[PDB]
């Protein structure tokens, strides 16, 4: 992180141990559920490349996830160097392996701020999105409401799987509009189709409140 | 947040990573149970509009909840601009999208304090109340004591659903007075009606202690 | 830990009580699952030998784990003294039993930094790896997919046991490549073998999504 | 201006009657109505004998589109009725195409008719694409032909159709073919898919 | 510019439906689509009712060829999609066809479609060549016709097909004519082969 000293000069602030422990708990217990990405974003707010590499070290227990995260980081660094051929931050500098700590702090504290931390964070988020896409327990087409399950639980599962799938935005809109209604159980499906097309999710949940 | 510097001049204090992680856990695990609103109020004490937008970013995983929260924020900003046509905070300024950080700190630190953080917080709380109202698993009329369930558990469920429903206050009073007694199981319902009308909840719980 | 004073001179920072409580929870609840090692690494970031001994004291509830950790520490200290016959840190100094606190801070704050904390941490990590290797509930050859279990759960179990086993890296690669396919259930195993050899884990998980 | 040919009109009538309403009616109508005027279009629509319910849908959709056009817009310029040809002379219809520069009155009405026909064929498709699934013994060839006909009739966005082709074709198939298709794995072509799945 | 004739489109759909995807479909398409612009070709393909699996193979092959064209060749120059007619306008296609030197987008698209149709026919060959064989009483005049129809469907290389005609034909022949072919011996033309086989 970054914080002002007593006089005011910006200086690197070490990431606290309990934050890293929380991130380790997130990596281990959750098994790369779709909820990790918001948790990673929260636990890494203001992170520099050194801190992000510290988090990646804990990620590195899983060989496959670590390998794909490294591959996506390398690819995005190559893209950055392709687009953009204290020195200007290169791809490896954004990756926090060649650039030193002081260069990172200077880049983040520059006027205007060079968002090295944020760009590296978004690369990591893309890699984590891919990893999450692997570990989705089932595809969206397999989510089906049970004979007795409440509509709220089915919608929760459907939207979780939708976050996992990471399709195109228009595809997601069509999915929520049509596939949600299609896969519902018959007793609910009658009411959903009677509501008609273009029904907002608020109408859908209110109409089917406790039908099961 | 806001905190005095070493000399004493007010300056923005960044929201800690672990607080945002806790808020993410609240958004994800709880599935918008009625308990989120107190937890949101606690986790966002002293929040500025920038911090509240930071929390909203984590909320933004859910498309429907994020959409309705944005819609309520826009509506309340329009209401604010309608009522009230460093510059005075406009609706978008309260929303923390046009106003800069320093303007927010100045507004909160003004004499008298302009409660930009609190008004934005209450708008967010209204939106979250609506979202919670969607995700209520069952309506209040479906809560019914089981044949063996203790009275304390039934009352807990009833009051949770009452918090979820968000009806008029007089309607809530009538509901607690009459509907609670009506839906109780027959063995308890005999004692509840024998207690008579206008019985305080303390009398109701003490009388039916361990009846089931 | 280590942190700059108000003037800037480096001084020892005490390990917070809540960090030690979290480490105690990790030692007790987890029962030396493979996830402890990342959690230990996170909770002990920047630790000096005195802090590491403080953590070891909480570890010392378990007689066998404490004994083996002490034995590995002594062995690695003997190796350090063998390789390398304020004074230079001896093996017992790295162990944080002969060296005083101020010598440790001076070593860590030296130019270049003497990584006494990190070397002691890696010795502790080797000992914890051995302890974890004892407490593995089953060997890798016993992990077998169930008739109905999803492929994601089976892969999670397999990689957890692989982390526990701690074999040679090439052995691990062969294990993930062949033994994972061999032990899968027949309905999945058909698809895995149809995918052919040299299939990346991404292909394996995507192909067998929801087959069970 | 030239009169519509009896051969063309008979072809339109016979294809509509024979095909009832299948997705190829849209390209057939577009081909046979090449550069036609609103009077010719109305002739082609009214000439259809059967499927008067479908013709009612088409007229209702034309009226709705005309109302929207009138909402968007209050030689004399054309209103929705003028575009639909209900209140336009043949000379008036020739105008707005003979006008320099012309405003394509015929093409707008053709687009409205195409929207109505898309709705009609979507209604006339006997099953939904998500409900299309393989029989226990149906050939994979017949399954995929039915699936792609239904997908053609679906009237959805193009990216949605691409995802549909990528996923539901493999997914909705029976387990016997599903095993072979998964063994082929993603990124394969339909040609490879059927050639492998011949048995 | 003149649009495709309704008689031509009706003939095309008629022959496609009646013949299925037999080998003659390719030359028939080449005949009917002479000088046809990409818009006309797209209409010609879209109007086909049924065989949507075949139309999907055709679309996929067109997309692959368009990608190859775009890779090889990076008014505005025509792209692969423009040749395919999905993106480029009718006027743009007409201008490209009229330009000197010409960019015959029609001919390139026709060649791509011919490739796709060849692949489709090779898929659609009902029985492999090795399976065809003379019956106990089937005349040689019909057995050889079946054999050569299938051989045209298979679309193997000429070097293979020489051996196929030389050996597989005589091998699969019925026992009565097998002896006659063997006696007649190698270096034989089809006229000799049949004219030695009657009865």
């Amino acid at each position: 992180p970054i914080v002002q000293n007593l006089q005011g000069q910006m200086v690197h602030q070490a990431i606290s141990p309990r934050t890293l422990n929380a991130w380790v708990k997130v990596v281990e217990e959750k098994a790369f559920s779709p909820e990790v990405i918001p948790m990673f974003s929260a636990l890494s707010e203001g992170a520099t490349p050194q801190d992000l590499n510290t988090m990646l070290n804990t990620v590195g227990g899983h060989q496959a996830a670590m390998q794909m995260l490294k591959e996506t980081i390398n690819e995005e660094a190559a893209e950055w160097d392709r687009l953009h051929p204290m020195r200007e931050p290169r791809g490896s500098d954004i990756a926090g392996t060649t650039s030193t700590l002081q260069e990172q702090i200077g880049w983040m504290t520059h006027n205007p701020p060079i968002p090295v931390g944020e760009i590296y964070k978004r690369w990591i988020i893309l890699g984590l999105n891919k990893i999450v896409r692997m570990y989705s327990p089932t595809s969206i087409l397999d989510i089906r409401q049970g004979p007795k399950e409440p509509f709220r639980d089915y919608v929760d599962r459907f939207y979780k799987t939708l976050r996992a799938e990471q399709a195109s935005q228009e595809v997601k809109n069509w999915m929520t509009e049509t596939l949600l209604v299609q896969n519902a159980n018959p007793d609910c499906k009658t009411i959903l189709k009677a509501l008609g097309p273009g029904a907002t999710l608020e109408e859908m949940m209110t109409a089917c409140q406790g039908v099961g």
Side-chain angles (χ1 to χ4, degrees), chain A residues 1-5 7-8 10-65 67-151 153-169 171-212:
Chain A
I2 40 157
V3 73
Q4 296 233 307
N5 211 327
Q7 52 260 31
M10 292 257 191
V11 74
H12 170 77
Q13 170 51 285
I15 190 162
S16 161
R18 259 151 69 196
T19 313
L20 292 173
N21 173 77
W23 170 236
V24 166
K25 273 147 68 169
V26 166
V27 166
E28 294 294 340
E29 307 206 343
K30 305 296 184 270
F32 295 113
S33 174
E35 278 275 42
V36 301
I37 286 148
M39 274 182 253
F40 171 74
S41 309
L43 286 157
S44 63
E45 210 71 358
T48 81
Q50 197 180 321
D51 322 82
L52 285 156
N53 285 115
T54 317
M55 321 205 78
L56 288 171
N57 280 277
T58 61
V59 165
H62 302 69
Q63 78 299 20
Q67 192 267 306
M68 301 166 118
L69 207 40
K70 256 172 191 292
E71 216 188 306
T72 297
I73 292 153
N74 264 323
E75 180 270 359
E76 298 283 322
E79 195 94 328
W80 167 263
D81 303 338
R82 195 204 86 190
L83 249 67
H84 300 302
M86 48 173 202
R87 82 192 152 274
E88 207 60 15
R90 307 307 319 157
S92 67
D93 299 315
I94 298 299
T97 165
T98 48
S99 153
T100 194
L101 175 53
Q102 285 81 47
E103 216 78 354
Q104 299 146 25
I105 303 306
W107 285 323
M108 294 204 343
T109 58
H110 196 235
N111 318 68
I114 292 156
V116 48
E118 181 56 26
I119 187 55
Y120 191 14
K121 192 177 158 206
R122 209 179 307 92
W123 297 354
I124 296 281
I125 288 154
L126 277 152
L128 272 157
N129 273 291
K130 220 187 291 301
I131 290 154
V132 166
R133 201 260 288 286
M134 171 185 328
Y135 274 90
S136 43
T138 50
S139 59
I140 195 82
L141 294 154
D142 324 285
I143 273 63
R144 304 171 91 61
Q145 189 167 12
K148 187 57 169 290
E149 184 172 5
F151 193 68
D153 291 13
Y154 167 75
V155 173
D156 164 15
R157 292 169 46 198
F158 194 91
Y159 267 66
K160 213 179 287 302
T161 300
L162 213 83
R163 277 220 304 289
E165 277 286 317
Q166 301 158 13
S168 312
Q169 180 53 76
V171 168
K172 271 161 136 56
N173 296 2
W174 177 91
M175 257 198 263
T176 52
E177 234 191 322
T178 300
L179 185 58
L180 177 71
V181 171
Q182 171 49 34
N183 279 320
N185 73 276
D187 322 299
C188 262
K189 175 151 69 178
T190 304
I191 293 147
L192 281 293
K193 256 179 283 199
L195 257 290
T200 322
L201 194 73
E202 194 163 16
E203 276 82 321
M204 276 194 251
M205 94 171 190
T206 45
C208 311
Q209 194 171 348
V211 166

